[PDB]
Amino acid sequence: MFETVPVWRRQPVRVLSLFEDIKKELTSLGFLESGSDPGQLKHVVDVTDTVRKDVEEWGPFDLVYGATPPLGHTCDRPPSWYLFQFHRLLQYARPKPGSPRPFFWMFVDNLVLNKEDLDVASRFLEMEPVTIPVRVWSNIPAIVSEEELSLLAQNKQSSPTKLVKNCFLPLREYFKYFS
Amino acid sequence: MFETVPVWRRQPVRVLSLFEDIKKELTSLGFLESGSDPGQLKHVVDVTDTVRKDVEEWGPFDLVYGATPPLGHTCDRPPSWYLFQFHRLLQYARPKPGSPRPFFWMFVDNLVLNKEDLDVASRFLEMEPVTIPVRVWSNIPAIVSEEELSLLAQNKQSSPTKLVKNCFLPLREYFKYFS
Amino acid sequence: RRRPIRVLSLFDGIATGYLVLKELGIKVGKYVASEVCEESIAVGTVKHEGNIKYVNDVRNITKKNIEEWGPFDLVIGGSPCNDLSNVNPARKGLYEGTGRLFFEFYHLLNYSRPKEGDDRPFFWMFENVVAMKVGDKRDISRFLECNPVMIDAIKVSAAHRARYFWGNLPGMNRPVIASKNDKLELQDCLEYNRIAKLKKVQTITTKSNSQLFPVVMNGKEDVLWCTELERIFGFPVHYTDVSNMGRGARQKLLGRSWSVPVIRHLFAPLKDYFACE
Amino acid sequence: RRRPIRVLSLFDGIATGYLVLKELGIKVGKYVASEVCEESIAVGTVKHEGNIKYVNDVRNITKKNIEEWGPFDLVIGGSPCNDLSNVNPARKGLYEGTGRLFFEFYHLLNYSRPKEGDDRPFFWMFENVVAMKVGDKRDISRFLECNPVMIDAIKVSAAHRARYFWGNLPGMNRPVIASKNDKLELQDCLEYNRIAKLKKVQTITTKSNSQLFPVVMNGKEDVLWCTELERIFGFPVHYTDVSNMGRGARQKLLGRSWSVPVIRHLFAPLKDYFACE
Numbered sequence A, B: 001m002f003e004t005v006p007v008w009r010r011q012p013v014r015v016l017s018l019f020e021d022i023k024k025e026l027t028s029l030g031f032l033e034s035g036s037d038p039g040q041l042k043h044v045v046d047v048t049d050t051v052r053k054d055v056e057e058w059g060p061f062d063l064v065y066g067a068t069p070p071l072g073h074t075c076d077r078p079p080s081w082y083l084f085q086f087h088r089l090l091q092y093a094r095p096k097p098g099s100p101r102p103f104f105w106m107f108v109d110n111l112v113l114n115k116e117d118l119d120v121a122s123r124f125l126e127m128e129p130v131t132i133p134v135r136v137w138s139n140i141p142a143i144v145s146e147e148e149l150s151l152l153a154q155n156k157q158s159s160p161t162k163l164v165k166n167c168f169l170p171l172r173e174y175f176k177y178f179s
Numbered sequence C, D: 001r002r003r004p005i006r007v008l009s010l011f012d013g014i015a016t017g018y019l020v021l022k023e024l025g026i027k028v029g030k031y032v033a034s035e036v037c038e039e040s041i042a043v044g045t046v047k048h049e050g051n052i053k054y055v056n057d058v059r060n061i062t063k064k065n066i067e068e069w070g071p072f073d074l075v076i077g078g079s080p081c082n083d084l085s086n087v088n089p090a091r092k093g094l095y096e097g098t099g100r101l102f103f104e105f106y107h108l109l110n111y112s113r114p115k116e117g118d119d120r121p122f123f124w125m126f127e128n129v130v131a132m133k134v135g136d137k138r139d140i141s142r143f144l145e146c147n148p149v150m151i152d153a154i155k156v157s158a159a160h161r162a163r164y165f166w167g168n169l170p171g172m173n174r175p176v177i178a179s180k181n182d183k184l185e186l187q188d189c190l191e192y193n194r195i196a197k198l199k200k201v202q203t204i205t206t207k208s209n210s211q212l213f214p215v216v217m218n219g220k221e222d223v224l225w226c227t228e229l230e231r232i233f234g235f236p237v238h239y240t241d242v243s244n245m246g247r248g249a250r251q252k253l254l255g256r257s258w259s260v261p262v263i264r265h266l267f268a269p270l271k272d273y274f275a276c277e
Ligand SMILES: Nc1ncnc2c1ncn2[C@@H]1O[C@H](CSCC[C@H](N)C(=O)O)[C@@H](O)[C@H]1O
Pocket: C010, C011, C012, C013, C014, C015, C016, C017, C034, C035, C036, C037, C040, C056, C057, C058, C059, C078, C079, C080, C101, C253, C256, C257, C258
């Protein structure tokens, strides 16, 4: 784990929100600054032509957020596309080995990843997903069976959840409060 | 061909009759002596254990005769068996290449060799058989379509012809004559 | 100083990487091959006498495995091209089916990479076909963070084989020149009493149709033999005479393989970076 | 003095006669092979680079051919054993089916023999199986005018193969002793990572069922490979890797062939009668 910092040292997070913007979400807890037009959040949706240098000049970043599109909606790209692109951009944003600064990342899927895709997701993000009745892969210190989950997914697919806010609570122990 | 011999030089032929004896038959012209109880004719029917020395020890021979069993008879042995044994014993009876002398051989089939055996018979005896309405393979001087032979073979199959004597006529020009 | 090369080969096939390194005279210290085809493993095991450590599926290689089996000096690999080629109508792209296996190479490549402070020499190379959509060629370049070079085996062998090559190997862009012992025409790859119609062969694949009757023997047309296919690709003769494989089985392994003289051209600059015999 | 050997081989198979003569270092002046199997002819043509004059069916060889192709110093041959063995229930004996082909050897042997008074060296040999009825073994001895010698390949190879050998070769009845490079146990004939259950193998024939699973690989039972069959019979490795032949085709040719180390034992005394390399 990362070691906590005195409250007078804490500074506002600068976050990289991929695919799904959480700017309005982060204001509710206060990791973001109400009014800062040059926001600390950098949001991109199409990253097919993003190079490592682009992220470096957009950096530094402390939290890297990636999320699959909401349920139903559209299959603009394969569901695996978001995980692979999230993993590629994450390695660009990680601090160098000569910097032990706090760095966090989170990837959440809204029941869009298939059975085989979960195994790929867990292998690349190096942890099994935990179930919150969405699945979340993240290094945050914060952290029902499949049949009901699958049948529920079938009903909604036949016809933008933001409950992940509760997972951001221990990020208050490393960064500012309503800033 | 061989050259004819003066009449005062001719001597009685000694013949080797295999499978089918022609002693009673050969007397009709007089090549053998009616009084000679041993006779110039040596007749064997079962030759499976005859060795080259046996034929040499029996003395010289001028005519070697072999014939398949008659049509109206069971086939104790395969039809090819008589040709192969005739060819083996014939090479034993031939005079040495150093001492030339009149030597003749004859193999006659009574419609017992099938189509497969005729090709083998002609190849081993080095001549195509001539039809005498029997088939004749021989080095004797001088000497109806199958359609007829095939249908005749079927009628004959349902139910010891000796017309071959007419082929023996020029052999009196090389050996003596009895009356 | 110079020490033997430790190689990690993903999607090893019939161990073309180990073959080329030993043919170059490079001392191979360790060769870890990720390979799942039973008949392919039998080839690399028999023809190289157990010098290759097989680890089976690439998706079962953990981060601890790369640390324990490491360090690695060379990471090579060519993902299957079944779902990446314009030939097959039932494609699954770069993200489904076997096309998604490329990211397993990308994953293990970053695991094997030396840290920033470690300036030790580290080389790698990825191979795939040219008949891929521009969207999939771009994405592979976006993940490997470099651009591929196209090297056709027609320049150095007797068959068409245009392939893309990503990597950081020294002098990948250098001009391809054919060596002395390269069989550059089909007649050079044939057996005795067999006559070649063409000088070069249409791109050979796993299927029999790789014209279809390019050889004449006893004044009659006939297909290529397995021994002749091996000569076309540059493999040693009877390299695939293993595990009772018939004509169809051996052509499958050869149809997915690398052109040996091409990989020799690519791996040649490694002789000046590692020990040699 | 000594002159190269001129050989006539009836029912040549995969040219074991030419192989043994060349392995002995004997200068082969002419090798006329009577052979009808396309796959078998392809072997002797490719593996010997056209030094063998093929004349196809033995029943089409005329007396003039033996004179023109002659003179011959060695006449070898082994008629098919399909209709002469106790194994096949539907036998046709020595006088029907393929059994009558022995007489074609007897026919061409006397054609090739030197006439009486010609003291030139002339050797010959006929091979057939031991599992023949006494009535046919006697008849073959009656026609070849000699007695056969029984030589089992178990003494010099890794397999049972009791065969009869007629002929006038020098010292056929001598005790058979195994040479230095003979692989007399199955483990010697196996490949890498392959474990042999038995020391010797049951007589190998044309059919696959020849025990049936005598090798262990990766802790699992497996049959013999084609390369291993060639080592058992004493042939060179990949000797039958010809004409896209699969497992069944190569076992067919090898199952009816001669044991090379046995034929080497028989042909060895010929070195003192003809030219050598
Ligand atoms: N999941 C997987 N893990 C490891 N290897 C795999 C795999 N899926 C397919 N492969 C391998 O992909 C190989 C073809 S890629 C070609 C191999 C290489 N170019 C050569 O030199 O031959 C196949 O032989 C197969 O064994």
